[model samples]
Target: MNEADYLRLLTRQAEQANDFLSNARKWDRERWVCQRFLEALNVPYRQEDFAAPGEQPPDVLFKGAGFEVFFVLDERPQRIAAAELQARLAPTLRKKAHNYSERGIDHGELDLLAFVNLKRAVPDFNTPFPPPTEYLRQGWRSLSMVGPTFARVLFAHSGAPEFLRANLGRSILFDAGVGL
Candidate 1:
């Protein structure tokens, strides 16, 4: 297809994805959004059922690839601080990587920790309400503290758009292609 044709197709796909996401409720919303993301990037993925026995399952696992993506929903919104959230996610990611290692899956591994900020409003003015971008930034910073770890964190509220904008969210695609 020509460049214009590809762009047209991409737009149509995105529109359809948005429609699906709009109709999805809670968990389904995150699932559909991530599915669309993987589809757009041409990454081969399997939904659930990919985790090993007794291991915390990733929401989506890439086929013949090392990375698994875990989707998180912050239903309580402002209830949990970003640091607290990171502390919870980082180790979970590490354990998952270790699980894969134990299973003798030697593909160079990575984890995509996707979080959605479902915070709509604050109870009072005294309660701090950070913008989604800032909150995601804080979360990313916290995750970075685990230097040399085998996980890459991505937040839905801000990270999704940022990833989509930069490389059109195709970094995973490229990495997978190069056998990473």
Candidate 2:
């Protein structure tokens, strides 16, 4: 082929590859978890795509009554020792704590963040309060993985983070008093 024709074809291929990579890096369950978590709160949101690199790490930004909850999703679930919960001063985060270093994402300035896992154990069929749902039966921890626990924790932790408290004028917590 002529030089001009060959160069144009190569340019076209490069553009296509760039677009593919951009989309491939897009967050997966983080986006979905953030969206669904808001739904559980009966909150409304508007999602804007990332047009520039490093603008924000979150998959979605949620705006509601008192403040906004910036969320980042790390869909990978790494198993923690289960003993991490016993560590003094360690945050009692509901998600597994072990594999965070290997499988976690850093959501810069995120007020709310979580990982949605595909593999999990559910709670018993007749558990009270959390309302034993199908996913809950697997003993999953996060709200996305364990619907009832998610609902419960979100309810209990219904206060905004310090930054959000100033932005939205309140806290976001679960109805049951769990803290993030």
lDDT (0 to 1) per candidate: 0.36, 0.31
The digit string of per-residue lDDT tens for model 1 on 1-180 reads 775554454344434434544566754554554554545444456677233323433333334222234443223113344345444454445565567567765323333434322222111222332333432433221111111001222333322333332332112311211211
Clashes of each: 0, 32
Any runs in candidate 2 off by more than 4 Å, and if so which? 1-25, 47-59, 64-108, 118-120, 124-149, 152-180
Error of 2 at 119 (Å): 3.7
Q: Give lDDT tens digits, candidate 2, residues 1-180.
A: 875554454344334433433464345434544454555545455666312224332334444222112222212122222122112112323232332324554312234333221122222223333332432322222222212224223221234333223323122333221211
How close is each model in CA RMSD to the real structure? 14.0, 16.9
**Model 1 lowest lDDT segment of ten:** 141-150
